[PDB]
Amino acid sequence: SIGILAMHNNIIRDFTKIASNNIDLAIEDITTVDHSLNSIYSLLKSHHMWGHINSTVKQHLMIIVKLINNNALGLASSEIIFLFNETNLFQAHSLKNILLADFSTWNDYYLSNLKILALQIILKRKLVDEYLPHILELFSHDKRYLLKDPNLKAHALTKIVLSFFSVTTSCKVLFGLKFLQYIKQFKLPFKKFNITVECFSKNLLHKNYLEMGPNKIYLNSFYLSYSMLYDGLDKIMLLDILSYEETTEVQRAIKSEYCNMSENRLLWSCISVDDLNVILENATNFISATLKCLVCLWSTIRLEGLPKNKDILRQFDCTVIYINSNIKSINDESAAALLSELLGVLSEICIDYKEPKRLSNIISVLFNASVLFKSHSFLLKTANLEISNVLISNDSKTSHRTILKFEKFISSAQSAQKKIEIFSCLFNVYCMLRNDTLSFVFDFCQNAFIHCFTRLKITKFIEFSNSSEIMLSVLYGNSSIENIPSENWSQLSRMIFCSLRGIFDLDKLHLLNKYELLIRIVYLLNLDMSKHLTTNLSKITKLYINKWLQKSDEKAERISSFEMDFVKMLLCYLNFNNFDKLSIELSLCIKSKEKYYSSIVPYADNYLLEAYLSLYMIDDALMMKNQLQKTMNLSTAKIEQALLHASSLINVHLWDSDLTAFQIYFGKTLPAMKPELFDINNDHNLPMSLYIKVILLNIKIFNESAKLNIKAGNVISAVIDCRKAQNLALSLLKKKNKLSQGSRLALLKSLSFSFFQLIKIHIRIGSARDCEFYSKELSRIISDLEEPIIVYRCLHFLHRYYMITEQTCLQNITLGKANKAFDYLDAEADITSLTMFLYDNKEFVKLEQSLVLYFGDQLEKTFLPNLWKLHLGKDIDDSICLSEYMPKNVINRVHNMWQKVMSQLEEDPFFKGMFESTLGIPSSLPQKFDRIAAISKLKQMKELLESLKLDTLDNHELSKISSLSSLTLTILSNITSIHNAESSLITNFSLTDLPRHMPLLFDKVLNNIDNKNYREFNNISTITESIRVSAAQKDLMESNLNINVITIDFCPITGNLLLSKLEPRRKRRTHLRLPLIVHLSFPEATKKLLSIINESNQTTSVEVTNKIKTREERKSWWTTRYDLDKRMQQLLNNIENSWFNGVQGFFSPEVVDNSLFEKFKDKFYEILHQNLPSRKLYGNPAMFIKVEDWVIELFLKLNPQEIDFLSKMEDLIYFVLDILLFHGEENAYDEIDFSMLHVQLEEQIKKYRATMTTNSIFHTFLVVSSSCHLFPWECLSFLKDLSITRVPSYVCLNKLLSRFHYQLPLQVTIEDNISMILNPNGDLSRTESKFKGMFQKIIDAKPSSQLVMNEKPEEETLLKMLQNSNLFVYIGHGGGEQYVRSKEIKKCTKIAPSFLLGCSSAAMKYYGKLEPTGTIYTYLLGGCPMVLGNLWDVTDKDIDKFSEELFEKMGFGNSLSVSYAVSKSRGVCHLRYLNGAAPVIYGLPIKF
Amino acid sequence: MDIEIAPQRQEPLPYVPEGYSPFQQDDIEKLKTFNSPYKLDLDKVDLLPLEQILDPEELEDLVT
């Protein structure tokens, strides 16, 4: 485009040089030059390079003058017109139009000199006489047409005036009046003419020289400008030119209409100054002819060059007010013609007197006339008059008001085409006023787009006339029209066009070259975002900072809105991708360049605050909050700046995790000061962009309200908040709107945060059911999403989740997915994501290494390195720890303390052997490691465990804390005699029950909460449940029921089997720990059991039983099931002989005879006295450690007639020998006569077994923990013949008993209201056949009873069955969960006793460290007092044998209870373990 | 010997937390669609009120 300009400059230099040499050749070839002049005039105007327009005019003016010097005056004239029309809005037909051309910034530098050139040609062609009335008009208002140029060629202008006086045949007096004026006004010598100046004055008062003809009108205007300069001197008076009778009679004619009607003037010329006042006033007193006279008056006022006067301006207002007052009274079109005539001459006056505000009035009258007349002709005159003001006024600020003015114009046009016609008057290059800034171009085009262009309603591309390239790019950049030929424009122009839109399909002489860097980083930024990448985000940010933003004062220019919206988007995108280091640098830089970027500082402060918070720079973040909170107020701020200030204060770390303080501010304070930040219904009807930003604010608040609630023990309200946040997010999306990039990014972060928080809340309470739901929901959204930082963050979160729920297959997959997702983001700029990546891949040293590289010498001001220590398990100094992360710190401290203590104890062989020994807590009556040291370190450990708040623990951690609390008490009570021995075991008993109670409690509460809580923009405490759980135990102990309540649990820490007994009748509490490691651990037994169940289950499936047909494959089926049935018997036998050998007596229902026991206790201590080395050689009997009675009783409950009697008794010996050992009584086994022990004990036991009274407990309640559920405990030999039912907690049990006045076994009537479902899917024909008879016989003789057979039951059918029955049996698959949702059963308060016969009806699906769930717990939460189900899948023939014997043995006389009946019915099955061990009972034992 | 049978495995009625409403594909579509940030925010006629208050050498010098 320069070689283009250099090409045409070459042509111009050829012409202007050779034309002067040979004038003949160049004249005929002037067409080539007019081409080149126009060619560059177009380019320079199109690229907004105004500065080169000036240098072109100079070469163009030089061509004109060389045409004059060679007397090619014809060409020279049309060159003056050529120059003018190429560089002005207004056009010219003749040199007349040049001479009366107003001054504008477009012709400021040549207009006067061009005019002098015009007068030179008029002179040289002798056309003065014809141009006379235009030249007289010119100098009459010289103050307007010529005397505005400060560098006006004075000597050249006056010399022209003198030469015109020389050749004129008329008005020779007027040309002399001006000549004498220009000589004195511009100090000049008169010696440019030998005759004196005084004689020159008198020489003009001749008869032929004062002759002006019809141009006597201008006489007054010349005399005024002459005499006003020459006051008090040799002044040529008025009475020298005009006689008395012609000046005096003027005044006298006025005193006695009175205007020349045919000449548009007043009757008199050269009217006096004060005599005009009586003329003006006389006209104010006043159909359509009256307008004609108003013309003649003001027409003369122009012709008389009288300076601006108040009397004139006062009548001016009266005139125009009268005009507007009676526009409607004009009906005909002749009177309309006069209106346009008067409003035309009135506007001319304003420009003379420089009255811009009075001109505005005339524009309004033209507009009103246009509307009333419905005349487009008037409306075009109105628009053009406003644009004339724009050029003449020369203000960029006024240009904003004129756009709003033009908005009213376009709306008034009488058609669609007329509207576009009016617009093109505004959208015009010469409205730029030679402004070379990007800010003005954008301000003008976007304003014209909002206010004007949208009123045009066009759907095709219109290349608006006489508009620049840059203007079209910016204007159509904001449009939505599809086919725009952008490829015609410059690349810089196209680059702005592309950035302005969402599409990216990609000269030294250009305005945009001044902004090349800025334009292309905006393009690159928007390019990345559209690809959902950040490949250049880092580079362009540093580039914008160093090579543009820092050169702010150097460039010294007002910042465009193009750059503003880019900054707002860059800060946003950097924030969205966690480029927090760059965010800080950028934000601090902008805040430093306040001089220019002050209007954008509220954005820089928002994203700087969120930056510090993202890097956990709380010290800086807190300083920023207190500054912001006190500087700016909300009552006067705009909603946008208010939203931004409030949105930055939502983070938890800014409130010290103080929920009440947070709630006060966003709940009471903020809504009181700025309510429309909470108007989610848009009652005040905000713009759709702001409304969404408001909805986004409330989403962000609810999400943060959840974090505080859950970190304050308000799980319920935390859930409600997360649900509110997601409901708003839904209503936001369904708003019919094209979601802006800014709000899309914001919503993406909020929505994922919402899912993250929801899952974390349900992890804390251990609900695997809900976690699994939200996990899949989240996992689904990620799939289609493409935002790398969102995808990676979520994949990383899911990976953590799958580790918790121990779903190893999904765990491996998501780890790979997250790793691959991490390549798609900048590891150098994103430290928060980097550490997460290094954490997942076990690179811990690199994790803390990359932290110190990132922060450097800023590491002192960030909690992030300490935060990762907490994540790694470390505990940190209390004084340096963030108050919010204090709970995690304490927990880590507890586990770290325990690890160090247990480590130092296990290196002493005394305690090493103690952790590998069976231990009881009420066991006795009250290198080398020091004893008092050990006691001390354990009493400290105990007091620390009692110090922590229980409402800050997830249920799995509370589980660890409880089993760690018990282990400490156990070890301590074996080493010494602690303070408050019994009360410690009572609380510790109810401590271990909380992790059993809370998950079941949350499950019940969460399913019954009202749905209206989620759509309006109940809470439980661990404290009140702590009371409940310790009172539930106190009530059981005081019921004095003759039962045993034995819990079976597993310890995660030690791997020990944990048994605890409760004896309401004996008022005794006992607990023991069993080191399990013929040898298999608890997990190894689980893996072996699950392996059998899974194989036996898939043999049961119809998928397999269908495909078997041959007799030979019937054998393969039975042989496999035969084997599985043996594999389990042997498994239960290993468990039977390894885990419980010698302590089985712990489960014995037998209660000892009190009179006999005291006798045995004498003999027992006798035997120990005689055979134990320590009791034979040291101290005296009164110093012997006494063993508790329940331990002594374990011997009496042995059976000498059993085959492995000695094995069991021997283990009890060790147990007693260990009780004594740990309390400090050493007994070398080498020195113990086990012969005597064996014989003397066996003898005394037999003597008891032959004289004992056979009384025993009534029932045994197994409190089986959820991790021990899958084991068929009731099929162990010592539990086989017992009356047993399972129970999930002390609270659940105590409720069930309290509900029925503590009467066992529960009596339930059978004479009415019994429900039964048989073969609901018709897949059990053989089963249906056996029971079809008895069931229908019952409902025949049972009132209000019902049966559903071979029929899929509706949900609301069995929902009233369960709630309105005395008995509910069901024979099908599962517990009928395919016919009723979990929700509705859990919504009940009372449910009939249920017999859930059928496959896996008591089975549960396990989810790692989260609580498992099954339909067994669903029924219990519904109010069911007794539910019977199968632990796995069973086959029909065996289970129906069982079902039959079950019903018969129960009486469905002295029939059996449900407990005995089941235990006495297991033997009917052919597979006594694969089928017989499957049924189980939860709840209270019942009898019909 | 004849083989014992087992009932057909049924799908339990789907669990959804109370009042929860999943995001449909129309909603996910709006979540992953890039729109230009510079995209701008989306008739009775009244009258307008009035306010109150030379030789060849001097030719070259003329353009040079």
Curated annotation (Swiss-Prot), chain A:
Q: How is its activity regulated?
A: It is inactivated via its interaction with PDS1, which probably covers its active site. PDS1 degradation at anaphase, liberates it and triggers MCD1 cleavage.
| Main location (coarse class) | nucleus
The catalytic activity, as recorded, is: All bonds known to be hydrolyzed by this endopeptidase have arginine in P1 and an acidic residue in P4. P6 is often occupied by an acidic residue or by a hydroxy-amino-acid residue, the phosphorylation of which enhances cleavage
Spell out the Pfam families in the cross-references: Peptidase_C50 (PF03568)
The alphabetized list of GO BP terms reads: apoptotic process; meiosis II; meiotic chromosome separation; mitotic sister chromatid segregation; negative regulation of protein localization to nucleolus; positive regulation of exit from mitosis; positive regulation of metaphase/anaphase transition of meiotic cell cycle; proteolysis
Q: Which UniProt keywords apply?
A: Calcium, Chromosome partition, Cytoplasm, Cytoskeleton, Hydrolase, Nucleus, Protease, Thiol protease
**Record: active site:** 1399
Q: Where in the cell is it found?
A: Nucleus; Cytoplasm, Cytoskeleton, Microtubule organizing center, Spindle pole body; Cytoplasm
Molecular function, one GO term: cysteine-type endopeptidase activity
Supply the EC number(s): 3.4.22.49
InterPro entries, per database record: Peptidase_C50, SEPARIN_core_dom
Its GO CC terms are: cytoplasm; mitochondrion; mitotic spindle; mitotic spindle pole body; nucleus; separase-securin complex; spindle
**What is the enzyme's class at the highest EC level?**
hydrolase
Q: Which intervals hold domain Peptidase C50?
A: 1311-1410
Record note on quaternary structure? May bind calcium. Interacts with PDS1. Interacts with MCD1.
The record describes the protein's role as: Caspase-like protease, which plays a central role in the chromosome segregation by cleaving the MCD1/SCC1 subunit of the cohesin complex at the onset of anaphase. During most of the cell cycle, it is inactivated by securin/PDS1 protein. It also promotes anaphase spindle elongation. A component of the FEAR (CDC14 early anaphase release) network which promotes CDC14 release from the nucleolus during early anaphase. Cleaves SLK19.
Q: What is this protein called?
A: Separin
Give the gene that encodes this protein.
ESP1
From Swiss-Prot, chain B:
Q: How does it assemble?
A: Interacts with the caspase-like ESP1, and prevents its protease activity probably by covering its active site. Interacts with CDC20.
Q: Which residues of the full protein are shown?
A: 258 to 373 of 373
Name of the encoding gene = PDS1
UniProt subcellular location: Cytoplasm; Nucleus
What is this protein called in UniProt? Securin
Organism this protein belongs to = Saccharomyces cerevisiae (strain ATCC 204508 / S288c)
Its PTM note reads:
Phosphorylated by CDC28. The phosphorylation may be important for ESP1 localization to the nucleus. Ubiquitinated by the anaphase promoting complex (APC) at the onset of anaphase, conducting to its degradation.
Primary role:
Regulatory protein, which plays a central role in chromosome stability. Probably acts by blocking the action of key proteins. During the mitosis, it blocks Separase/ESP1 function, preventing the proteolysis of the cohesin complex and the subsequent segregation of the chromosomes. At the onset of anaphase, it is ubiquitinated, conducting to its destruction and to the liberation of ESP1.
Where does the source fall among the domains of life? Answer: Eukaryota
The Swiss-Prot or TrEMBL note on domains reads:
The N-terminal destruction box (D-box) acts as a recognition signal for degradation via the ubiquitin-proteasome pathway.
State the family it belongs to: Belongs to the securin family.
Disulfide topology:
none
Kindly list the positions at which Phosphoserine occurs in this protein.
21, 36
